[PDB]
Design a protein around this ligand. Structure first.
Ligand SMILES: Nc1nc2c(ncn2[C@@H]2O[C@H](COP(=O)(O)OP(=O)(O)OP(=O)(O)O)[C@@H](O)[C@H]2O)c(=O)[nH]1
Ligand SMILES: [Mg+2]
Lengths: 87, 49, 283, 46, 14, 103, 368, 360
RNA sequence: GGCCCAUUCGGGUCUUGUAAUUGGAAUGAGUACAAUGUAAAUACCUUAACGAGGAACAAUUGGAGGGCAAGUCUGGUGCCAGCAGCCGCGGUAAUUCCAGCUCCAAUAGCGUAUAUUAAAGUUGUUGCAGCUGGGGGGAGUAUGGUCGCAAGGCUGAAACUUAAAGGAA
């Protein structure tokens, strides 16, 4: 019957995820994964996120070099710079 | 404990050193580290003096 | 007495919600008799319908709608006591619950499970009915267990619900004095509107048939998903009359309506006064 | 690149959250402690 | 970041 | 406080401070309630973050005064009332599981 | 006349207007400017267009209800069929097509046949986000990705929930059990009810395994519905030092390659002593070994930790109970609990040997 | 499975009402008998806007482009931006977002980027002063169209920040059984990248037509100077008539183009407004669609709104046919009981709508 | 080793403890023979039999204070400060864990909210805008709240890189 083949495909996914539940974990759900408890370099293909200490060193681009460039254009145009003065 | 359950302020137990890494005895935790660090700091302070 | 007047006038205030129950021809209030297997129920439904409609309704089945007032009529149905599924469904749609308690044995987990399922799905009115008051010679322990059941029932329903005490069964059903003032308790209950029920069009089915074609069954051979008519009163919000309205029949699956023909009322209430024994009907 | 982007978006999120929580704290302080002190002021007359 | 929590998508078969 | 009564019934609008990142902070256990008598919106506490998930919305709350016995530390002075019931059930009994909240 | 013309839908709309006497264009149709100029040179056509709280809410809603009645008092097949339709107390026959065979075959009239009308939301599937709670009288704790039968609206259905926590409102990260005595969040693939609706949940619905305990296991309300959830499961990467200096160390095995360390450069690590640190550069010849810098000198008996987060998925599993399509109508069996599967196929429960706690005794700490 | 429509008419209303109702639709024969048959780029980018706003909705355009399959999903909102094409202004895309706007998880904070105005579409002032007050009294309270910069056609370059931040459950039931008394009549005359005298010429033309009615006329004036002016010369005028005791409004706008006299455009928009007042009753001919859409997605009650005879048209009843085609509801036009005019009062019983996306 | 005092340093004192083992006695709630009582029955009264070790035959209510994790969050002048913590790697037939953390008070009773009563410092004057109308001390300080006012930047000069003239240096 209609409910019969509904029931057997239900029982199919019943069986496949009940032995997913009994069967062995993925490594990636388990915590404390060492080096020897992983696929070797599964981590390049991982797309894993985390946090870092400090903002890394800025890569100097054309737009930031023209930013401080027309900054000092404005500055040395109006001569509002800062030096020492003689005593 | 005004609005706290005694099944809520339970006792979390602390973990031991891994048995593979057992020759370096006693995985030390934060109380052991502060006992280490303030000893080092008082001895460096008197050395600087 | 002014502070008393303020603190009493305060507890009249409640959350103002809509009603969505009509005042002209309201549906028959669904009374669900809920008990563990082996107490009351049948004998109790039989006794109540015999007092209400003067008709010995031996061998009950299904929902039973009778007229019990000048404008209050009500539907009697009984949960199968082993099924948590039917327990859950009638918890979700019942309006009054006659909660059968074996007072000799005490409280039980089937009635406790119904009380919690109802409490989470929108607690209806609950009148507790304690039977098997044949404890021993000890009227002392009768009174003791009486008080203990009343207090434990009062911690599960509001403090001041009605626990009713039925004596021993006499000639097949309960004493008619006790069933008379039990129906007096059912007749004044003052129902308050729930939420899921009053934003959802539901219906308990008292009549069922398949209007399929038997020679089509002879052609294809009993595997056929066959069409079905379902007759009954509907409660809650107005169910729309266009075909294609989606409907969950709670226990067989999800369907959509095909055609609705509303029928004249099989158990109608008639238009100080009293209720005529001519007009005490039964469907 | 992901380092710089993640750090600066986390800083932005924290600086937004602190402003939001401080805002709701002192709006609950001001426009309800005025009513608390008004009730205390008109209860001291009794 | 635009893809990260989407679930739909237009299916342009043109 | 409420006028002439000792308690007042109210309607839960929305759990204020639901995004506070500190458990059991006074900002977090802090509910906004519309009193039903005069219609005005006040703010009330709740005993803890643990009993904060017994109120959700339009819950028919009942609220009394607070009564601070001393200047607290993590306080927000300027919230006067505390929630003492919810849907006609005492939420201290709910918090210690003596009753179940009916709906 | 005009309503019958509008809803008589085999005639063109201009034919409705013609026998009574397009929306990409937003601004409506006007005349020519010259016709409108000669029409509105005059002005006098439109010169007359120119020139307690609880009882209050109840009065507003009863005012709406009397408006409902006095505007329902209209045409009889308009009211009683099509403008509202079948209010309450109407006795109806209702025909369903394609009802299963097993209902009509095994129809036992003891079990009630209830029907309820689904809203536009409740025909949608997807992730329902609830907050739930182990019921205080249910004995055993609940486990994520163990099925339980929910009673969510009209439907009863067995699903695989996964219990989460928003740990101080930062993540929504994944627990492995429900808490003992309070609420957690949860997320299950099921039919999307509206928010703020309550539900129960049951481990076992049959009677052969009904036991002696309390059978309702979970209670809760629904917080939110969505088509997707983004929940995470913490994974830490552990590595050990093998060459320690002041303030820096060489860390052995949390990575398998210098490409992996290059992927993870600059990340903050810490020892189990809470000494914070940062990984700096992959060493060249031993492959997964790198150089980290710490707050101060770590020891040879430490473990460093890189706390990362792995995303986890809810399992799109849904079977409604369909108890009335059985020959017994109790004894419904769905997916089993994980302890029941282990007891069936006799697998021992997974025991990490160095996950078990011990009785640590401190040695006295003396320094030189 | 799919409710089937034909032709590329009412396309935005069909996709909008399918998103509200949650019903999968197909639109078949999108201009199939044509030289370049199929969907155009502005309605394809409208589909992209729908995918931006919702989540889990699958749209499925065919090979030939002449039929589309919309299986809707949950409205989630969020902050976005939309770089709509030059074929339609930002009003063509912010008009169908005002229906979906108060019914999402997160509040609408979108900024559209493109041409500001068009002859045959909604403007910034149109959207704001006409279409925001009818939502403002249908239940929303915080809605705002901001102009950060505006761009006249053909090059445009103007950005518009639509922000709605009241996420209501459902719109309230309307009860407008009156014709609202017009208290004032105001407006806004705008001009970008042209001389500031054109605005005063437009204002003087509109007010010399308006001067013979005995109400009060006030037209505000904005020239746009700088980067806020956009990439093209343009100018236009939008008048509203304002009922202040209830909040109702009746608007009319247009824009000038290459060879247009500003006094001519001012008097044209003034006479077009007075004709909208004539053919209007409690709504406008263009405020009427979302008015009756919010009345049909209100509560499960009766909501009644007065309309006049001349507001009935092929557009209005094809709207009503599409409403009944999607979620099976009828309007009941009962006439008023006084006979100096022909006004119906449309009563709609709203479906039982709630927004189920907003977290509780 | 316990206890007591004290702001401090410290002082005063003394058979005191322990989920340590263990022993036989006691009976009461309950379960119940009866007889008495009474029209009859209930109850009171009298009363054989059984009835305790977690005496599990399982009294509460409120308060004070800790302590813990390869845990989480916030701040910032390393290792800290704070908020806190049912959420930890695994694990639920799994675990045996600060032995179920310690202490305190009432005890068949015990909290909370609101209103209150009593106590005397009961003045010797003048407290505002004057022909009556009144909030609550003096001196200050802070402000992620609400309402305002306020910055830019040579003017002309923007749709125009535009004149004369002026300013500034
Ligand atoms: N002594 C005594 N017996 C009762 C009482 N009420 C019901 N019964 C007995 O209960 C027996 C079982 O039948 P029902 O009471 O009809 O059973 P039910 O309560 O309907 O429960 P199900 O068997 O699950 O249907 C009957 O034969 C009655 O004699 C009562 O108050 N006292
Ligand atoms: Mg029976």
């Amino acid at each position: 019957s209609s409910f019969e083949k509904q029931q057997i495909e239900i029982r199919k996914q019943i069986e496949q995820l009940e032995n997913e539940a009994v069967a062995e974990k993925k490594w990636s759900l388990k915590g404390e994964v060492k080096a020897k408890d992983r696929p070797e370099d599964a981590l390049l293909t991982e797309e894993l996120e985390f946090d870092r200490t400090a903002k890394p060193v800025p890569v100097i681009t054309s737009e930031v070099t023209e930013s401080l460039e027309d900054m000092i254009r404005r500055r040395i145009q109006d001569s509002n710079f800062d030096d020492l003065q003689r005593r | 404990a005004k609005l706290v359950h005694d099944v809520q302020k339970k006792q979390h137990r602390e973990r031991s050193q891994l048995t593979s890494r057992s020759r370096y005895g006693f995985l030390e935790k934060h109380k052991d580290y502060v006992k280490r660090a303030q000893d080092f700091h008082r001895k460096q302070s008197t050395l600087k003096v | 007495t002014m502070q008393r007047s303020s603190d009493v006038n305060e507890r009249k205030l409640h959350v103002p919600m809509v009603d969505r129950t009509p005042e002209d021809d309201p549906p028959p209030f669904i009374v669900a008799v809920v008990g563990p297997p082996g107490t009351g129920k049948t004998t109790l439904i039989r006794s109540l319908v015999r007092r209400m409609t003067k008709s010995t309704l031996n061998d009950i089945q299904g929902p039973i709608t009778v007229v019990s007032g000048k404008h209050r009529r009500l539907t009697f149905l009984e949960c199968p006591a082993d099924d948590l599924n039917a327990m859950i469904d009638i918890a979700k749609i019942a309006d009054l619950v006659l909660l059968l308690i074996d007072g000799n044995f005490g409280f039980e987990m089937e009635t406790m499970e119904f009380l919690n399922i109802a409490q989470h799905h929108g607690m209806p009115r609950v009148l507790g009915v304690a039977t098997h008051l044949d404890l021993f010679k000890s009227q002392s322990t009768l009174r003791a267990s009486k008080k203990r059941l009343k207090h434990r029932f009062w911690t599960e329903v509001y403090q001041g619900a009605k626990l009713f005490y039925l004596s021993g069964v006499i000639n097949g059903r309960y004493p008619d004095r006790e069933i008379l003032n039990l129906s007096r308790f059912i007749s004044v209950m003052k129902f308050r509107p729930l939420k899921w029920r009053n934003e959802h069009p539901y219906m308990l089915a008292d009549r069922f048939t398949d209007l399929t074609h038997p020679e089509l069954i002879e052609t294809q051979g009993l595997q056929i998903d066959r069409k079905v008519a379902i007759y009954g009163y509907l409660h809650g919000t107005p169910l729309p009359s266009a075909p294609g309205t989606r409907v969950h029949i709670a226990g067989v699956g999800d369907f959509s309506v095909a055609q609705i023909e509303k029928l004249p009322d099989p158990c109608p209430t008639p238009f100080r006064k009293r209720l005529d024994d001519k007009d005490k009907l039964i469907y | 690149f992901e380092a710089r982007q993640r750090i600066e978006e986390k800083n932005k999120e924290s600086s937004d959250y602190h402003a939001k929580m401080a805002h709701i704290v002192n709006t609950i302080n001001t426009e309800e402690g005025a009513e608390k002190n008004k009730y205390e002021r008109e209860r001291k007359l009794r | 970041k635009m893809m990260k929590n989407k679930r739909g998508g237009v299916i342009d078969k043109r | 406080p409420f006028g002439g009564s000792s308690h007042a019934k109210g309607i839960v609008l929305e759990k204020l401070g639901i995004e506070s990142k500190q458990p059991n902070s006074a900002i977090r256990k802090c509910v906004r309630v519309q009193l039903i008598k005069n219609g005005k919106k006040v703010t009330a506490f709740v005993p803890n973050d643990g009993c904060l998930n017994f109120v959700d919305e339009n819950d028919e709350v009942l609220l009394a005064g607070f009564g601070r016995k001393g200047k607290a530390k993590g306080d927000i002075p300027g919230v006067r009332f505390k929630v003492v019931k919810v849907s006609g059930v005492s939420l201290l009994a709910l918090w210690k599981e003596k009753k179940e909240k009916p709906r | 006349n005009i309503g019958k013309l509008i809803y008589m839908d085999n005639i063109s709309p201009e034919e409705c207007i013609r026998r009574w006497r397009d929306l990409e264009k937003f601004v409506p149709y006007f005349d020519t400017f010259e016709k409108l100029a000669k029409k509105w040179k005059s002005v006098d056509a439109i010169k007359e267009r120119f020139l307690t709280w609880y009882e209050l809410q109840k009065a507003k809603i009863s005012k709406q209800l009397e408006i409902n009645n006095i505007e329902y008092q209209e045409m009889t097949p308009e009211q009683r069929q099509r403008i509202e339709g079948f209010k309450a107390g109407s006795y109806v026959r209702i025909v369903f097509e394609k009802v299963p065979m097993e209902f009509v075959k095994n129809f036992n009239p003891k079990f009630p046949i209830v029907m309820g009308g689904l809203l536009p939301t409740e025909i949608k599937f997807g992730i329902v986000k609830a907050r739930l709670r182990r019921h205080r009288w249910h004995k055993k704790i609940l486990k994520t990705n163990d099925p339980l039968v929910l009673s969510l609206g009209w439907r009863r259905f067995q699903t695989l929930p996964i219990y989460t926590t928003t740990d101080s409102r930062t993540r929504t990260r994944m627990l492995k059990y429900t808490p003992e005595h309070t609420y957690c969040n949860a997320a299950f693939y099921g039919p999307l009810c509206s928010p703020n609706t309550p539900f129960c949940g049951v481990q076992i619905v049959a009677n052969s395994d009904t036991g002696n305990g309390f059978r309702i296991a979970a209670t809760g309300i629904v917080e939110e519905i969505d088509v997707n959830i983004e929940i995470v499961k913490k994974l830490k990467l552990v590595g050990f030092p093998y060459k320690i200096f002041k303030n820096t160390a060489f860390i052995k095995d949390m990575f398998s390659s210098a490409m992996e360390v290059a992927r993870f450069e600059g990340a903050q690590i810490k020892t189990v002593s809470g000494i914070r640190g940062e990984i700096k550069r992959a060493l060249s010849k031993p492959e997964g070994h790198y150089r980290a810098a710490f707050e101060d000198k770590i020891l040879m008996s430490d473990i460093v930790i890189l706390r990362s987060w792995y995303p986890v998925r809810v399992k799109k599993f849904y079977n409604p109970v369909t108890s009335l399509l059985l020959k017994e109508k109790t004894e419904w069996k769905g997916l089993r609990l994980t302890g029941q599967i282990r007891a069936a196929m006799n697998l021992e429960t997974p025991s990490n040997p160095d996950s078990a706690y011990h009785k640590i005794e401190r040695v006295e700490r003396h320094f030189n | 499975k799919y409710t089937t429509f034909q032709g590329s008419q009412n396309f935005r209303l069909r996709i909008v009402l399918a998103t509200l109702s949650g019903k999968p639709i197909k639109i078949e024969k999108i201009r199939s008998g044509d030289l370049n048959p199929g969907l155009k780029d502005y309605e394809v980018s409208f589909l992209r806007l729908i995918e931006s706003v919702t989540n889990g909705s699958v749209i499925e355009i065919s090979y030939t482009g002449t039929t589309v399959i919309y299986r809707p999903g949950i409205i989630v909102g969020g902050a976005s931006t939309h770089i709509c094409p030059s074929s339609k202004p930002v009003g063509y895309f912010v008009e169908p977002m005002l229906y979906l706007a108060p019914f999402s998880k997160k509040k609408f904070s979108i900024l559209f980027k493109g041409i500001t105005a068009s002859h045959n579409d909604a403007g910034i002032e149109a959207i704001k002063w006409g279409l925001m007050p009818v939502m403002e009294k249908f239940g929303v309270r915080e809605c705002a169209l901001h102009t950060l910069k505006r761009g006249s056609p053909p090059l445009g370059g103007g950005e518009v920040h639509l922000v709605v931040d009241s996420l209501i459950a459902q719109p309230i039931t309307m009860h407008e059984i009156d014709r609202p008394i017009i208290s004032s009549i105001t407006g806004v005359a705008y001009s970008t990248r042209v001389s500031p005298s054109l605005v005063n010429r437009m204002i003087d033309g509109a007010k010399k037509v308006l001067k013979n009615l005995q109400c009060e006329v006030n037209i505000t004036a904005d020239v746009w100077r700088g980067e806020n002016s956009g990439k093209s010369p343009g100018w236009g005028i939008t008048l509203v008539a304002q009922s202040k005791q209830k909040g109702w409004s009746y608007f009319a706008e247009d824009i000038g183009d290459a060879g247009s006299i500003p006094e001519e455009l001012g008097e044209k928009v003034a006479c077009q407004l007075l004709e909208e007042i004539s053919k209007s009753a409690a709504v406008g001919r263009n405020q009427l669609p979302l008015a009756i859409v919010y009345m049909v997605i209100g509560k499960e009650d009766i909501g009644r709104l007065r309309i006049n005879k001349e507001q009935i048209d092929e557009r209005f009843i094809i709207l009503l046919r599409d409403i009944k085609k999607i979620f099976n509801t009828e309007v009941f036009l009962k006439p008023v009981d006084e006979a100096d005019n022909e006004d119906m009062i449309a009563t709609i019983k709203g479906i039982g709508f709630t927004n189920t996306s907003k977290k509780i």
